[PDB]
């Protein structure tokens, strides 16, 4: 899975160990070994949520499988809990787009997950 977080929160508020924690949490959550998990955090973004520049985040989770109505509902719970606790962002100022990638459409090591 690939998890990306874009936020207007300044880099300095991102705690030491945040990428480590997202990896471990997401691995336990999707059931995938952590080795396949990529994490990208982008701090200091311009962005606005209701024409308001209060702390917010726009995230996305891509995965070959493990995406679904029930599943995504659990992930919002997990992910929004972390941004709240770790970065102090209100959950209702957080959007997370979920993507169910087809294996043939993910290139990895000079080829794709055929």
Pick from 41, 55, 87, 89 the residue near a second copy by CB under 8 A.
41
Q: Are strands 2-7 and 38-42 parallel, antiparallel or unpaired?
A: parallel
Q: Write down the least CB distance from residue 9 to a second copy, Å.
A: 12
Pick from 37, 55, 87, 89 the residue near a second copy by CB under 8 A.
37
Sign of CA dihedral 59, 65, 69, 71: negative
Residues forming beta bridges with residue 42, ordered by sequence position: 6
Pick from 9, 56, 87, 89 the residue near a second copy by CB under 8 A.
56
Q: What CA dihedral angle connects 5, 31, 100 and 9, to 10 degrees?
A: -10
Q: Is 107 in the site for a second copy (CB under 8 A)?
A: yes
A 10 A CB-CB count for 59 gives 22
Q: Is 105 in the site for a second copy (CB under 8 A)?
A: yes
Rounded Cα distance between 40 and 53, Å, is 22
Binding site for a second copy (CB under 8 A): 1-2, 4, 6, 11, 14, 19-20, 22-24, 34-43, 45-51, 53, 56, 58-59, 62, 67-69, 72-73, 75-77, 79-81, 91-92, 94-101, 104-112, 114
């Amino acid at each position: 899975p690939m998890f990306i977080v874009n936020t207007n929160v300044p880099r300095a508020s991102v705690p030491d160990g945040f990428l480590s924690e997202l990896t471990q949490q997401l691995a336990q959550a999707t059931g995938k070994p952590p080795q396949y998990i990529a994490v990208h955090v982008v701090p200091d973004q311009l962005m606005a949520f209701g024409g308001s520049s209060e702390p917010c985040a726009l995230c996305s989770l891509h995965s070959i499988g493990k995406i679904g109505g029930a599943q995504n509902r659990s992930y919002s719970k997990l992910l929004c809990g972390l941004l709240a606790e770790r970065l102090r962002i209100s959950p209702d100022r957080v959007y997370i787009n979920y993507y169910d990638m087809n294996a043939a459409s993910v290139g990895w090591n000079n080829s794709t997950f055929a």
